[PDB]
Coordinates of C-alpha atoms and ligand atoms in Angstrom, one line a residue:
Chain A
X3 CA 13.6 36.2 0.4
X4 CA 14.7 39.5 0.2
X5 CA 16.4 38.9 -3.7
X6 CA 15.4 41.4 -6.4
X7 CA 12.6 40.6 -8.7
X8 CA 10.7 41.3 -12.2
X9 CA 8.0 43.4 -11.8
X10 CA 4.9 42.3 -13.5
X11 CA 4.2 44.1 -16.7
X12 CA 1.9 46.6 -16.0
X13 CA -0.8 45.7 -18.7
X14 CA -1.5 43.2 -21.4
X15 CA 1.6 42.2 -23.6
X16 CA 0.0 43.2 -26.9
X17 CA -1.9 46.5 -25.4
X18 CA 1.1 48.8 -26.7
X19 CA 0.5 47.9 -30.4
X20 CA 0.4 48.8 -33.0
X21 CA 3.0 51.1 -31.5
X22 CA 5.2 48.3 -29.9
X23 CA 4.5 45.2 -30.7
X24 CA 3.3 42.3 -28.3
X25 CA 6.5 39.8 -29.6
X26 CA 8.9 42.6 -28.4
X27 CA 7.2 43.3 -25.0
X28 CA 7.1 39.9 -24.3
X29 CA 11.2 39.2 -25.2
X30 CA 11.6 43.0 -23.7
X31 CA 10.2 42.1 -20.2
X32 CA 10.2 38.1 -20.3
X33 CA 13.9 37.8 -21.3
X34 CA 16.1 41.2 -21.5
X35 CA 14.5 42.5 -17.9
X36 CA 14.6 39.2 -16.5
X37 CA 18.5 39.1 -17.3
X38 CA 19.7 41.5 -15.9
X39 CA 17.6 40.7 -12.7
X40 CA 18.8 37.4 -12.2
X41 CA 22.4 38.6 -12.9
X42 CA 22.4 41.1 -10.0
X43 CA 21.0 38.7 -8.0
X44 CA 24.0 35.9 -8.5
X45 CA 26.1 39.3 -8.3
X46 CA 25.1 39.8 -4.6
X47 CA 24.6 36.2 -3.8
X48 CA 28.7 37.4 -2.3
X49 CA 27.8 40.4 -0.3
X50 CA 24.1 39.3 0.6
X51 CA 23.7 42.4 2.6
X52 CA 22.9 44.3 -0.5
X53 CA 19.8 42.9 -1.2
X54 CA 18.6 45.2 1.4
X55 CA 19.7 48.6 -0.7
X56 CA 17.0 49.5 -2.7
X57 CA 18.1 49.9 -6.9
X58 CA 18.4 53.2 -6.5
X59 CA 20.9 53.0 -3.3
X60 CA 23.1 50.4 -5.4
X61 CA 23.0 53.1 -8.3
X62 CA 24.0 56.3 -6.2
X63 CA 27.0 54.2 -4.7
X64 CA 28.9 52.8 -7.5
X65 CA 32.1 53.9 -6.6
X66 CA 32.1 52.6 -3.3
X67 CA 30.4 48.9 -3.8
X68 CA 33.1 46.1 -3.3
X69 CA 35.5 46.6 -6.1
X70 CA 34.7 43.0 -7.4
X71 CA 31.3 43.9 -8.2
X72 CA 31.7 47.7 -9.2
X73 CA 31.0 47.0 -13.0
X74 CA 28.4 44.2 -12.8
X75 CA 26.1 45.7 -10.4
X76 CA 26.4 49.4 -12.4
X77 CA 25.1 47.4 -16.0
X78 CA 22.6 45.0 -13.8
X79 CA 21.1 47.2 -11.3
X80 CA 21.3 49.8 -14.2
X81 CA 19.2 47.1 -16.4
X82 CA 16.7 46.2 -13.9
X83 CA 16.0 49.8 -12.7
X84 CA 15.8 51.1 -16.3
X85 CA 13.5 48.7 -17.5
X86 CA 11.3 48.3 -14.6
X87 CA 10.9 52.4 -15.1
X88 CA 10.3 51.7 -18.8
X89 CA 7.6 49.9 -18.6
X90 CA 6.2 51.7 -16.0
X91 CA 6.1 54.7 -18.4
X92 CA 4.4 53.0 -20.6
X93 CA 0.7 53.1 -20.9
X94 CA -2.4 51.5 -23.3
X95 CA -4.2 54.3 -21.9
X96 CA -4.5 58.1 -23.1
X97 CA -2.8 61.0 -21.2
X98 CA -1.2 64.0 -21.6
X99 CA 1.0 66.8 -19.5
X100 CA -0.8 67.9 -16.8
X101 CA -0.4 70.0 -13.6
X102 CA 3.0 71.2 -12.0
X103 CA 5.1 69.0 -14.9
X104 CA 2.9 70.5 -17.7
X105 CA 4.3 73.7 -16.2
X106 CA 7.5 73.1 -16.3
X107 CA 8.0 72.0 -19.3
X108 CA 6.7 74.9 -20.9
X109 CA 9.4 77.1 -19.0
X110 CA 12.1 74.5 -19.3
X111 CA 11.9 74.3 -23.3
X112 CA 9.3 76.6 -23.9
X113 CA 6.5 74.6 -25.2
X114 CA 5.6 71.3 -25.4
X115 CA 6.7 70.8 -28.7
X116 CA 9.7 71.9 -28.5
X117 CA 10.6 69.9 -25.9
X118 CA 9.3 66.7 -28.1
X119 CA 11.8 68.0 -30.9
X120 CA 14.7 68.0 -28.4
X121 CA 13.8 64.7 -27.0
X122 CA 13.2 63.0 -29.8
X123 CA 16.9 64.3 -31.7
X124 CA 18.4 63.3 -28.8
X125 CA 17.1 60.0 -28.7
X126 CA 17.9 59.5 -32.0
X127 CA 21.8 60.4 -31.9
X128 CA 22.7 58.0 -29.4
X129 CA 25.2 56.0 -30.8
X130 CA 25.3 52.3 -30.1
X131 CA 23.3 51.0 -26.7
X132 CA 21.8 53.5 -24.5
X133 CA 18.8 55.5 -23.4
X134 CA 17.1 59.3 -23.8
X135 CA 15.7 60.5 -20.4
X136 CA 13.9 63.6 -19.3
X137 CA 15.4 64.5 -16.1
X138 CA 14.8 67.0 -13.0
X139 CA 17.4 68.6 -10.8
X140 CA 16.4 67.7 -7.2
X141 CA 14.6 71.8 -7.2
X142 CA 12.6 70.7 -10.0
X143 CA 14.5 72.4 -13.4
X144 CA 14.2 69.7 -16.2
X145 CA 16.4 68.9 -19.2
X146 CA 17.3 66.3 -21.6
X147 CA 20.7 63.7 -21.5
X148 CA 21.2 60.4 -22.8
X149 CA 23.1 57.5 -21.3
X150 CA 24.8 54.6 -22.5
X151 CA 24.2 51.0 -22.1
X152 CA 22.5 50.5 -19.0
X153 CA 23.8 53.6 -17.4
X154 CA 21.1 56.0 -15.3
X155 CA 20.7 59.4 -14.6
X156 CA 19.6 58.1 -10.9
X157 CA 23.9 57.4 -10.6
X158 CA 24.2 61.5 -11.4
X159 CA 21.5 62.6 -8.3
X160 CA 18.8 63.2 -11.6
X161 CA 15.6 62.5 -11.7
X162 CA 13.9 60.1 -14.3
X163 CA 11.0 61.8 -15.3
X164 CA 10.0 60.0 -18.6
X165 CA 12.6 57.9 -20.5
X166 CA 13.2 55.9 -24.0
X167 CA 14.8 52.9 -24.3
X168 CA 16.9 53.0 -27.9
X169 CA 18.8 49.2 -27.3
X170 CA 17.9 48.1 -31.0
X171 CA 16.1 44.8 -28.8
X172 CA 13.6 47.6 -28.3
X173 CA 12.8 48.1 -31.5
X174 CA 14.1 46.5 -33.9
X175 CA 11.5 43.4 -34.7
X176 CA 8.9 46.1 -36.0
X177 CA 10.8 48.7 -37.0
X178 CA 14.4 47.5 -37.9
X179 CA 16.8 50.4 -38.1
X180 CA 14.0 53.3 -38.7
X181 CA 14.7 54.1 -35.0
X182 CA 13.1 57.9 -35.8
X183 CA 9.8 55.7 -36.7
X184 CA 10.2 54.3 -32.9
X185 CA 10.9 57.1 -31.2
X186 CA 7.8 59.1 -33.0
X187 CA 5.3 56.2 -32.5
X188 CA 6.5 55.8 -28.6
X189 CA 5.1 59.1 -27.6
X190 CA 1.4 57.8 -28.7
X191 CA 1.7 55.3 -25.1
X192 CA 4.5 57.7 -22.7
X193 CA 2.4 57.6 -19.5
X194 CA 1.9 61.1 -18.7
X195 CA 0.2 60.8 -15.1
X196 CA 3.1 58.3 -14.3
X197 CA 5.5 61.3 -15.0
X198 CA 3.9 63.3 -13.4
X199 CA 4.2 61.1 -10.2
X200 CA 7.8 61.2 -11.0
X201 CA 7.9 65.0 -11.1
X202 CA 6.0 65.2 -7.8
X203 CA 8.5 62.7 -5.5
X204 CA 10.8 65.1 -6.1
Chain B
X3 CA 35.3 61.3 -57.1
X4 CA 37.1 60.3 -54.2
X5 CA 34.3 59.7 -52.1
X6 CA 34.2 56.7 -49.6
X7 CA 31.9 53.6 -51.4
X8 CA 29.8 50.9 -49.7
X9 CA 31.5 48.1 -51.0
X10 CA 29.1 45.6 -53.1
X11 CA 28.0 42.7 -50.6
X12 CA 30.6 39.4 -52.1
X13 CA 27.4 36.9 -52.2
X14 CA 24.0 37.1 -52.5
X15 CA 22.2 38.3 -49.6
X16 CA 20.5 34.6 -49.0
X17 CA 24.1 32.7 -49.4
X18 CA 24.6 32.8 -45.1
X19 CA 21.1 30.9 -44.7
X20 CA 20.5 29.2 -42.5
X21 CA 23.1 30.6 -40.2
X22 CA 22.4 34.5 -40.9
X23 CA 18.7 35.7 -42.5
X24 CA 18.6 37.1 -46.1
X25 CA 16.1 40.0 -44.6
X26 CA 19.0 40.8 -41.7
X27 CA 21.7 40.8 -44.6
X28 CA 19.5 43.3 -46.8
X29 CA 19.2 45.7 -43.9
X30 CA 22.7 45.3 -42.3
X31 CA 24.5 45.9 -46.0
X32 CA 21.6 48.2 -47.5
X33 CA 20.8 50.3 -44.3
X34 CA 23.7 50.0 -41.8
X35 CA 26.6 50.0 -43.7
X36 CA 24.9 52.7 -45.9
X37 CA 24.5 54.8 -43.4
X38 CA 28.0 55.2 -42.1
X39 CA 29.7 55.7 -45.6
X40 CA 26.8 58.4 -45.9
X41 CA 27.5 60.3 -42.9
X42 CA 31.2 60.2 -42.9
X43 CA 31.2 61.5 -46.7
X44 CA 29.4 64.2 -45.4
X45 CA 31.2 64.8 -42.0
X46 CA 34.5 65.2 -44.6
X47 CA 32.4 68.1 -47.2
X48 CA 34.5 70.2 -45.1
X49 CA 37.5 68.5 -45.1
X50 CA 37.8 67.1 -48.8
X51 CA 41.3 66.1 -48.5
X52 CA 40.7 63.4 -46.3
X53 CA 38.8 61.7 -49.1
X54 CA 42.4 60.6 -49.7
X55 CA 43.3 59.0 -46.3
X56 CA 42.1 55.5 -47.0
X57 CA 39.8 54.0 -44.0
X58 CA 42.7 52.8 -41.9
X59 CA 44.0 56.5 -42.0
X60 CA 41.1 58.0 -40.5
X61 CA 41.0 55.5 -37.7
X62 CA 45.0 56.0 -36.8
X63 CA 44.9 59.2 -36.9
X64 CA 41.9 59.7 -34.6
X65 CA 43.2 62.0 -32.4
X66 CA 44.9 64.1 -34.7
X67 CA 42.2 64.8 -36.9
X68 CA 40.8 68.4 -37.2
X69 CA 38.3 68.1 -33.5
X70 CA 35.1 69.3 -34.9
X71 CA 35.0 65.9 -36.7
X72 CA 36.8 63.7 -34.3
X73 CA 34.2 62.0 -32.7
X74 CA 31.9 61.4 -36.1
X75 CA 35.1 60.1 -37.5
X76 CA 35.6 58.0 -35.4
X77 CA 31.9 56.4 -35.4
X78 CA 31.3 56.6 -39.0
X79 CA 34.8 55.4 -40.3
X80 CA 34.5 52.7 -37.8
X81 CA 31.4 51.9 -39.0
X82 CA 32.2 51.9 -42.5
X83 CA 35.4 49.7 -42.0
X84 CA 34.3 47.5 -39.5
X85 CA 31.4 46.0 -42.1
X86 CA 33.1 46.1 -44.7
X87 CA 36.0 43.7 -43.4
X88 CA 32.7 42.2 -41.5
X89 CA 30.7 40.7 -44.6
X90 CA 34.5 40.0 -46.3
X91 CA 35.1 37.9 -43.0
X92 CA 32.1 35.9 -44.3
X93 CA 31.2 32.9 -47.1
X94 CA 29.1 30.2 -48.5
X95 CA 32.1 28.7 -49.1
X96 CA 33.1 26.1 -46.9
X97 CA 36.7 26.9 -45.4
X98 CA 39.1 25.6 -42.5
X99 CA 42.3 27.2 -40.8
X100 CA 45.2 26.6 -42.5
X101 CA 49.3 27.9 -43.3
X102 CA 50.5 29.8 -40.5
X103 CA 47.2 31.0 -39.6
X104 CA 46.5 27.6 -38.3
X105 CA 49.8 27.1 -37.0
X106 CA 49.5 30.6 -35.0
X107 CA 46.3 29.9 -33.6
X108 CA 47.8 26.3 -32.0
X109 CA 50.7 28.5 -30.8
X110 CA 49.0 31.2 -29.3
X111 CA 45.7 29.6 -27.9
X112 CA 46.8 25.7 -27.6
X113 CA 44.8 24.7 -29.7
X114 CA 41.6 25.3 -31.8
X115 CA 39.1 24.4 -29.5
X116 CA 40.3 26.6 -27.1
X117 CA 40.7 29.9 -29.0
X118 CA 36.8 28.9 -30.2
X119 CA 35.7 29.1 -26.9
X120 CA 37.8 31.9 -25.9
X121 CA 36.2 33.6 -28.4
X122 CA 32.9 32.8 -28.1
X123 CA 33.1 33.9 -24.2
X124 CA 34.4 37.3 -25.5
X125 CA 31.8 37.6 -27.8
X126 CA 29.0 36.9 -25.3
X127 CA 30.2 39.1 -23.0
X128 CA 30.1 42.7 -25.0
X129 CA 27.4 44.7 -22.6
X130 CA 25.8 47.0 -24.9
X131 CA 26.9 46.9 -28.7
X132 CA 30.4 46.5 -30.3
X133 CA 32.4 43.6 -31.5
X134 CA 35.0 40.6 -30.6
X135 CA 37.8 40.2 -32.6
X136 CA 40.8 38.0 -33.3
X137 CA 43.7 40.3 -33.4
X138 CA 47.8 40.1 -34.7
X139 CA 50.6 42.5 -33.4
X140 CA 52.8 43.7 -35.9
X141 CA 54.7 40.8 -35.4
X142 CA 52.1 38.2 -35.5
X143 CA 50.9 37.6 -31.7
X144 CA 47.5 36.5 -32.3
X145 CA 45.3 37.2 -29.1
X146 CA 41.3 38.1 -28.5
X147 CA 39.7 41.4 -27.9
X148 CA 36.5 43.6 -28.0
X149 CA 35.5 46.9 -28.8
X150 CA 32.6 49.1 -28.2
X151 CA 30.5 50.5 -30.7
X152 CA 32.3 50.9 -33.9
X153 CA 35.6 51.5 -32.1
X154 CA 38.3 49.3 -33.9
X155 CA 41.8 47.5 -33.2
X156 CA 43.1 49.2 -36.2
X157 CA 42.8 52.5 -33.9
X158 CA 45.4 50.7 -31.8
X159 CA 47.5 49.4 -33.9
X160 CA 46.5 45.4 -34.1
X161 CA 45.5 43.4 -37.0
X162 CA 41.9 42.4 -37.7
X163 CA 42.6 39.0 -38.4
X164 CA 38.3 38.0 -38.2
X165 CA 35.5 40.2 -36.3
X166 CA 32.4 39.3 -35.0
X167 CA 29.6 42.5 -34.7
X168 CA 27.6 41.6 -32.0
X169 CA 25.2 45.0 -32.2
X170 CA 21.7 43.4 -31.8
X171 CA 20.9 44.6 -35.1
X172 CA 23.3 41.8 -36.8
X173 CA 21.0 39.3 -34.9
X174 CA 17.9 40.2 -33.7
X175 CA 15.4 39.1 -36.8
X176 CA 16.8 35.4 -36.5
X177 CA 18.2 34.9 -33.0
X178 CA 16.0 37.7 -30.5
X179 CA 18.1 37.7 -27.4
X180 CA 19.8 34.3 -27.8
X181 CA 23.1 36.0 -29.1
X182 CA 24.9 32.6 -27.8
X183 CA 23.1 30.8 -30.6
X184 CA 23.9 33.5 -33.2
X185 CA 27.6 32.9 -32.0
X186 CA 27.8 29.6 -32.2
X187 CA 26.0 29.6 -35.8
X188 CA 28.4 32.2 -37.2
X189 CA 31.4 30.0 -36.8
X190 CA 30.2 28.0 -39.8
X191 CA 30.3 31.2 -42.4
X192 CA 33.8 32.5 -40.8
X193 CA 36.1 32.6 -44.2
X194 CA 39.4 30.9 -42.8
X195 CA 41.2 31.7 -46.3
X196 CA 40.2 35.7 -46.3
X197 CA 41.7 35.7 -42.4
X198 CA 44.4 33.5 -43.8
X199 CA 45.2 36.8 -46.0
X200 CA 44.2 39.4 -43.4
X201 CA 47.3 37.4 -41.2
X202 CA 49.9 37.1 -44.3
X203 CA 49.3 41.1 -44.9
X204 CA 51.0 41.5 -41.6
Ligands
CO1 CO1 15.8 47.2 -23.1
CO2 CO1 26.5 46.0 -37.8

């Protein structure tokens, strides 16, 4: 069985609160994830050679999957990818910047804080569905873009360093439509070793 | 003061129970709708004249509209019209098709049962946020559409006849991820007479 699947969450439903709570990590991962897994995967069920491109392979060739498929793969693969990478960023634990991506954010934006500003305004102007990413040229220069819906920077050859999920499912159960309250409060669990892993696959 | 209003909701805030929460009514009307009228009242300080194009102005004339305020234009008066003619589309009172609403609806879909589910599909299948709508050509076509965001039909010249907003934040508190059953409930608080009138203003 070579089909996509749901990767585990990577700790306890309830060990992101009081920052996210456990009833939205469960419907986040349990149901939303588990969507748009199971709809790529009846997607492909046609064309089962597929299931041996990785996500990011079905991401970087959009425009040249079966025209049939085109659209459903771009908002599944994008769903499945996204969130996997979501919670991945995630943490219970403490961390902060470190290392080579520590660096380069201070040259990037100029200070830590000034990149949180950006992020965070970004993030908060998305209009409708999408998602705010920190992102890395494949020589390492980082900057901030958003996408919409299920759309990923991985289809424009960037790389995801850390990114926010601002579909109202992610938030809305505990903080209803004070997204800013979200988007402040995330930052207290962003996994700052796991970016750094991203930075460093570069 | 010719200054867009949020139009007073046309029931109390509980009157949709059990089909739509009070708490989801409070924020939708309070916050939501709120927040558009606010931000296009300010996007127009600029521009005070347009406080006299009425809603339906702003959104045909889109692309004629000065550019630095295109795109927030767009959003906010979308946003501002699309609830309001939302919660209108709405009542306690119990209602059915009739006149040549009904009659139109037989004519262009077969019958009732079959523009329901028509419209139901359409309304399932919005990826990311926006809306489903029931729509009449100048001449009275009736036929089924989406939009994204708060884009509307009025922007292309077609008739909201009734509109559904399936942005997670009209469902979320009651329904989670289940939009299917949010739907299916909100067929029982559609206000036949009010699209009965939206149809005859054609
Ligand atoms: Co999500
Ligand atoms: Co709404």
């Amino acid at each position: 069985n070579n089909k996509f699947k749901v990767k585990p969450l990577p700790y306890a439903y309830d060990a992101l609160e009081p920052y996210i709570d456990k009833e939205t990590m469960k419907l986040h991962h349990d149901k939303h994830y588990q969507a748009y897994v199971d709809k790529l995967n009846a997607a492909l069920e046609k064309y089962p050679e597929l299931y041996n491109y990785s996500l990011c392979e079905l991401l970087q060739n959009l425009d040249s999957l079966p025209k049939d498929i085109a659209t459903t793969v771009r908002n599944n693969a994008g769903g499945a990818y996204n969130h996997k990478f979501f919670f991945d960023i995630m943490t219970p634990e403490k961390t902060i910047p470190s290392e080579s991506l520590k660096e380069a954010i201070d040259r990037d934006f100029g200070s830590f804080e000034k990149f949180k500003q950006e992020f965070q305004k970004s993030a908060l102007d998305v209009f409708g569905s999408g998602w705010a990413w920190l992102v890395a040229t494949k020589d390492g220069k980082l900057s901030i873009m958003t996408t919409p819906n299920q759309d990923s920077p991985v289809s424009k050859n960037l790389t995801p360093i850390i990114g926010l999920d601002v579909w109202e499912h992610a938030y809305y159960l505990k903080y209803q439509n004070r997204r800013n309250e979200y988007i402040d409060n995330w930052f207290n669990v962003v996994n700052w070793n796991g970016a750094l892993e991203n930075y460093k696959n570069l």
